[PDB]
Scaffold this motif. Sequence first.
Motif, PDB file in Angstrom:
ATOM      1  N   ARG A  18       2.477  16.059  20.220  1.00  0.00           N
ATOM      2  CA  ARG A  18       2.723  16.718  19.006  1.00  0.00           C
ATOM      3  C   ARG A  18       4.194  16.591  18.826  1.00  0.00           C
ATOM      4  NH1 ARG A  18       0.747  22.923  18.958  1.00  0.00           N
ATOM      5  NH2 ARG A  18       1.642  22.950  21.079  1.00  0.00           N
ATOM      6  N   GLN A  19       4.538  16.203  17.541  1.00  0.00           N
ATOM      7  CA  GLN A  19       5.848  15.747  17.186  1.00  0.00           C
ATOM      8  C   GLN A  19       6.355  16.348  15.929  1.00  0.00           C
ATOM      9  OE1 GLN A  19       6.519  11.697  17.133  1.00  0.00           O
ATOM     10  NE2 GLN A  19       5.019  11.043  18.731  1.00  0.00           N
ATOM     11  N   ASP A  20       7.496  17.014  16.120  1.00  0.00           N
ATOM     12  CA  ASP A  20       8.322  17.592  15.058  1.00  0.00           C
ATOM     13  C   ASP A  20       9.664  16.882  15.088  1.00  0.00           C
ATOM     14  OD1 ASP A  20       7.144  21.139  14.745  1.00  0.00           O
ATOM     15  OD2 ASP A  20       6.262  19.469  15.809  1.00  0.00           O
ATOM     16  N   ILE A  21       9.705  15.708  15.802  1.00  0.00           N
ATOM     17  CA  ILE A  21      10.920  14.940  16.025  1.00  0.00           C
ATOM     18  C   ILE A  21      10.613  13.629  15.374  1.00  0.00           C
ATOM     19  CG2 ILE A  21      10.025  14.039  18.312  1.00  0.00           C
ATOM     20  CD1 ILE A  21      13.720  15.213  17.673  1.00  0.00           C
ATOM     21  N   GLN A  22       9.430  13.437  14.788  1.00  0.00           N
ATOM     22  CA  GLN A  22       9.101  12.312  13.961  1.00  0.00           C
ATOM     23  C   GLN A  22       9.772  12.575  12.646  1.00  0.00           C
ATOM     24  OE1 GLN A  22       6.991   9.392  15.103  1.00  0.00           O
ATOM     25  NE2 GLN A  22       8.646   8.898  13.538  1.00  0.00           N
ATOM     26  N   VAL A  23      10.126  11.429  12.033  1.00  0.00           N
ATOM     27  CA  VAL A  23      11.023  11.382  10.844  1.00  0.00           C
ATOM     28  C   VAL A  23      10.508  12.176   9.640  1.00  0.00           C
ATOM     29  CG1 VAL A  23      12.213   9.932   9.070  1.00  0.00           C
ATOM     30  CG2 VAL A  23      12.171   9.293  11.573  1.00  0.00           C
ATOM     31  N   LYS A  28      10.120  18.285   6.714  1.00  0.00           N
ATOM     32  CA  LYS A  28       9.177  19.281   6.228  1.00  0.00           C
ATOM     33  C   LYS A  28       8.984  20.306   7.341  1.00  0.00           C
ATOM     34  CE  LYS A  28       7.157  19.481   2.775  1.00  0.00           C
ATOM     35  NZ  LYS A  28       5.877  18.937   2.483  1.00  0.00           N
ATOM     36  N   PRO A  29       8.183  21.414   7.061  1.00  0.00           N
ATOM     37  CA  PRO A  29       7.745  22.341   8.086  1.00  0.00           C
ATOM     38  C   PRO A  29       6.643  21.683   8.953  1.00  0.00           C
ATOM     39  CG  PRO A  29       7.595  23.463   5.912  1.00  0.00           C
ATOM     40  CD  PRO A  29       8.003  21.985   5.672  1.00  0.00           C
ATOM     41  N   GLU A  30       6.111  20.559   8.507  1.00  0.00           N
ATOM     42  CA  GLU A  30       4.945  19.962   9.041  1.00  0.00           C
ATOM     43  C   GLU A  30       5.161  19.373  10.445  1.00  0.00           C
ATOM     44  OE1 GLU A  30       2.924  17.320   6.132  1.00  0.00           O
ATOM     45  OE2 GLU A  30       4.595  17.981   4.763  1.00  0.00           O
ATOM     46  N   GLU A  31       4.007  19.432  11.158  1.00  0.00           N
ATOM     47  CA  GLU A  31       3.923  19.047  12.530  1.00  0.00           C
ATOM     48  C   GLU A  31       2.829  17.974  12.518  1.00  0.00           C
ATOM     49  OE1 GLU A  31       1.853  21.555  15.976  1.00  0.00           O
ATOM     50  OE2 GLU A  31       2.087  22.927  14.258  1.00  0.00           O
ATOM     51  N   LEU A  32       2.972  16.942  13.388  1.00  0.00           N
ATOM     52  CA  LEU A  32       2.075  15.882  13.422  1.00  0.00           C
ATOM     53  C   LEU A  32       1.484  16.009  14.759  1.00  0.00           C
ATOM     54  CD1 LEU A  32       0.888  12.897  12.771  1.00  0.00           C
ATOM     55  CD2 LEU A  32       3.117  12.079  13.650  1.00  0.00           C
TER      56      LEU A  32
ATOM     57  N   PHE B  70      13.117  11.334   4.387  1.00  0.00           N
ATOM     58  CA  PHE B  70      12.085  10.594   3.597  1.00  0.00           C
ATOM     59  C   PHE B  70      11.045  11.486   3.060  1.00  0.00           C
ATOM     60  CE2 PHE B  70      14.675   6.597   3.375  1.00  0.00           C
ATOM     61  CZ  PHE B  70      13.671   5.774   3.742  1.00  0.00           C
ATOM     62  N   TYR B  71      11.399  12.750   2.736  1.00  0.00           N
ATOM     63  CA  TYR B  71      10.463  13.699   2.198  1.00  0.00           C
ATOM     64  C   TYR B  71      10.060  13.257   0.844  1.00  0.00           C
ATOM     65  CZ  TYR B  71      14.132  16.726  -0.011  1.00  0.00           C
ATOM     66  OH  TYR B  71      15.255  17.082  -0.798  1.00  0.00           O
ATOM     67  N   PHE B  72       8.863  13.690   0.416  1.00  0.00           N
ATOM     68  CA  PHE B  72       8.287  13.349  -0.855  1.00  0.00           C
ATOM     69  C   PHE B  72       7.530  14.499  -1.476  1.00  0.00           C
ATOM     70  CE2 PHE B  72       9.829   9.322  -1.580  1.00  0.00           C
ATOM     71  CZ  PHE B  72       9.817   8.588  -0.372  1.00  0.00           C
ATOM     72  N   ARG B  73       7.440  14.475  -2.901  1.00  0.00           N
ATOM     73  CA  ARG B  73       6.717  15.551  -3.671  1.00  0.00           C
ATOM     74  C   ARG B  73       5.764  14.760  -4.472  1.00  0.00           C
ATOM     75  NH1 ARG B  73       7.964  20.737  -1.630  1.00  0.00           N
ATOM     76  NH2 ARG B  73      10.210  20.936  -1.303  1.00  0.00           N
ATOM     77  N   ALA B 126       7.119   5.901   5.317  1.00  0.00           N
ATOM     78  CA  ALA B 126       6.235   6.202   4.250  1.00  0.00           C
ATOM     79  C   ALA B 126       5.781   7.700   4.390  1.00  0.00           C
ATOM     80  CB  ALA B 126       5.015   5.347   4.228  1.00  0.00           C
ATOM     81  N   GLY B 127       5.691   8.474   3.245  1.00  0.00           N
ATOM     82  CA  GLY B 127       5.229   9.822   3.240  1.00  0.00           C
ATOM     83  C   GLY B 127       3.802   9.987   3.787  1.00  0.00           C
ATOM     84  N   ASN B 128       3.445  11.237   4.130  1.00  0.00           N
ATOM     85  CA  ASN B 128       2.169  11.495   4.877  1.00  0.00           C
ATOM     86  C   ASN B 128       1.227  12.161   3.911  1.00  0.00           C
ATOM     87  OD1 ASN B 128       4.114  10.553   6.778  1.00  0.00           O
ATOM     88  ND2 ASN B 128       4.011  12.482   7.972  1.00  0.00           N
ATOM     89  N   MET B 129       0.575  13.225   4.393  1.00  0.00           N
ATOM     90  CA  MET B 129      -0.558  13.833   3.728  1.00  0.00           C
ATOM     91  C   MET B 129      -0.132  15.306   3.666  1.00  0.00           C
ATOM     92  SD  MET B 129      -3.998  11.902   5.437  1.00  0.00           S
ATOM     93  CE  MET B 129      -4.591  11.502   3.726  1.00  0.00           C
TER      94      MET B 129
END
Lengths: 56, 150, 150, 150, 150
Positions: A18-23, A28-32, B70-73, B126-129
């Motif tokens: 789990r990566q919060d150090i990914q670009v 974002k607040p998001e976690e992968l 590389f954030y996106f809306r 590239a942006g995610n989901m």
Amino acid sequence: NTVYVLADPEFVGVMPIRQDIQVIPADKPEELRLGWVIYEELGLAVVNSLAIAKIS
Amino acid sequence: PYVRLGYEGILNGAHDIDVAGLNGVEQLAGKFATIGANGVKLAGDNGTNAVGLFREDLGDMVNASEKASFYFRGGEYYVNISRTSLTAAGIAAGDEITCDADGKMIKFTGTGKALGVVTHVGEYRAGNMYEKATQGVTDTDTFIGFIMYV
Amino acid sequence: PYVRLGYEGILNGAHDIDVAGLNGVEQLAGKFATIGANGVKLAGDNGTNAVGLFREDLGDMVNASEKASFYFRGGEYYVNISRTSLTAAGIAAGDEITCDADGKMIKFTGTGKALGVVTHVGEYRAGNMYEKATQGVTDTDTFIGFIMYV
Amino acid sequence: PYVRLGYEGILNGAHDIDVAGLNGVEQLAGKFATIGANGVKLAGDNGTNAVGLFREDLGDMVNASEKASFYFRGGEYYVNISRTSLTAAGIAAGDEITCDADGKMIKFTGTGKALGVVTHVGEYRAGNMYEKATQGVTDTDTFIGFIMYV
Amino acid sequence: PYVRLGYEGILNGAHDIDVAGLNGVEQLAGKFATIGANGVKLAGDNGTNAVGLFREDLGDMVNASEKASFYFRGGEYYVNISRTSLTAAGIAAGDEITCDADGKMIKFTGTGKALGVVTHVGEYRAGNMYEKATQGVTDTDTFIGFIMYV
């Protein structure tokens, strides 16, 4: 019988990372969440194991 | 040195009208660029970046969003498409950029998968989901990118 | 009519103007709130509410996030002129909703050059711009529901 | 609108007030001279401005560029109209200042004349080409403290 | 980021093997066409080979490269008479192939002279042994994906 036909060699087993150090997740607040395994296959009798297709 | 001086060629094409319906401008409305990071090469043509996003402001400048790293809306959120010229031709770097709100043609430079859209400041991802479309059955991530909107 | 808000059921006591764009027209249709993929068992009531600072984070869906002051950039406001009643509850599906911003002329808030900000639910507040801001940089002849191109 | 109220100096000066002899494009719309945060009459980094480099901030205020990189300065810009009296001749104090769009002289102090960066001072200096913008093909003379027409 | 190299993700096109030299006739002492060089279908390394060049590792099956490059033996490096490969695995047509040994144009793989060892991606690189037997064109420094006449 599944055990007999093939055997499962495992190079590395199933592990989560789990990566919060990914670009793109960092910004974002998001976690992968990644889930992966790296696998391989052994065939102990690939020259046999019976199968049928209905013609009925 | 590096491209983005004088009359120079194009990445996103020249003088596009009618390239978007309701999601992008169809009249020519271009305006000059105050640039962020465009990577190893000035005004793009390389792996990293390719000429980043602009968003319109009042005056004769349009300038950086600037979204990093590389954030996106989703839906509309402005992308830079084609260029215009008046004394110098080429996509950004003190030359006229035509923008849209997420219209065509976008055509940015990458290695492999992603690609995607570039901003200024960051590497080519590239942006995610929950940043672009997470509508119906889709795969997009930071490893997975193609030129157009997802 | 009157006060209806269903029962067959047409007024609907809420009117929100589709302001067509400028230099080639642009539209955007009212957005639903759904988290990822498209909503099941109806799609519920709109993510967008007249007089509220929202941002699309998904292609057909709109959600929370509040645009932070400092350095002028584009829209993502989606202010829609206030309806009569239901002004601290949001606006429910079957009443008039749109999105206004991003490549079109918008609906403004605040009377004079004295501006402040908006809450999601349809209320207005005072506040100076110091960690959040709403609406474009003030101009001459700018009042509530006035058409600024941003 | 213009006023002889508040502070009639240019804070953090070096040249102070300046008067550009060419008139550019009008964009006389009203706005506050409150530096950064809104209602903050004066603040760190008010810089040497008068017909210098400017940056608008989202909200209802315009102010100093206040940025050391990533809006490198080539092409057109934003300027304050100095033809109207203003608080000084550009920014300072609160209160309504009319500003315009580029087509006026700005001031450098670097060895910029054809290739530019951004200084938080909102003065112009030398590019390098690599990620920094290009003004035109146009040349101006370098003597330091000279007024270049953009 | 992320770029495949070999293994059926690179497109090397097609090239004609009945071009240059003498051209023999259809006869036996051939070998079979499959993906893998001792492997099985859908499991094989692959060079920058297209048409021309394929070396047996175990069994009397061919696909590109793989075999110690200290000593090449078998009669030439094997060439195709009167079928042109329609894959870019080097050869993997899925038939029994009748081979020849007249002078016939090939596709090479790997940087530098083949006189070395094998890289297990389907390439030649320099080993601890030098002044070992070379392939095709000599006197000439060969690189990855060169066209040699045997």
